Write a protein that binds this ligand. Structure first.
Ligand SMILES: CC(=O)N[C@H]1[C@H](O[C@H]2[C@@H](O)[C@H](O)[C@@H](CO)O[C@@H]2O)O[C@H](CO)[C@@H](O)[C@@H]1O
Length: 137
């Protein structure tokens, strides 16, 4: 029915439906600031002051093979998802976020089953960073 919940799920859950474009959008910097499925519906912290991260190139979810999600105690506070490495079906990968500004880190690895379309992304945020996310089929 879906992937595990990566990271943590204690904060507020928002749900984002994957459109026909099959795209996942993120804002990231030293951690993961926001996740969405369009440029307009990202869930996470606001862009204010020096916070919010940068909007990255979208992840093509139909070309996605696996994720490597790093979570830990972020240096500026709290447990969140701080880095995600997306590995595509061609063997290339993109690393968003960082593993260098957090301690007490854990790594969760998950491979999208062949021929299963991700229809929805659940995201847990407390209004600053992304604490967790989940793929749903
Ligand atoms: C590494 C990076 O891309 N830094 C960008 C920086 O990110 C800040 C902050 O905005 C983020 O919320 C946190 C957590 O990811 O990390 C850093 O502290 O934001 C700048 C603009 O706000 C960008 O110019 C930096 O590239």
């Amino acid at each position: 029915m879906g992937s595990p919940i990566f990271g943590y799920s204690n904060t507020q859950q928002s749900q984002r439906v994957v459109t026909a474009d099959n795209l996942m959008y993120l804002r990231s910097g030293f951690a993961i600031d926001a996740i969405g499925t369009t440029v307009n519906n990202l869930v996470g912290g606001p862009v204010q002051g020096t916070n919010g991260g940068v909007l990255r190139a979208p992840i093509a979810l139909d070309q996605l093979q696996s994720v490597e999600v790093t979570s830990g105690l972020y240096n500026w506070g709290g447990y969140h998802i701080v880095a995600i490495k997306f590995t595509m079906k061609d063997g290339s990968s993109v690393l968003l976020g960082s593993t260098h500004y957090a301690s007490n880190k854990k790594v969760e690895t998950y491979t999208v089953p062949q021929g299963k379309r991700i229809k929805q992304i659940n995201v847990w945020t407390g209004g600053w960073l992304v604490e967790g996310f989940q793929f749903v089929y």
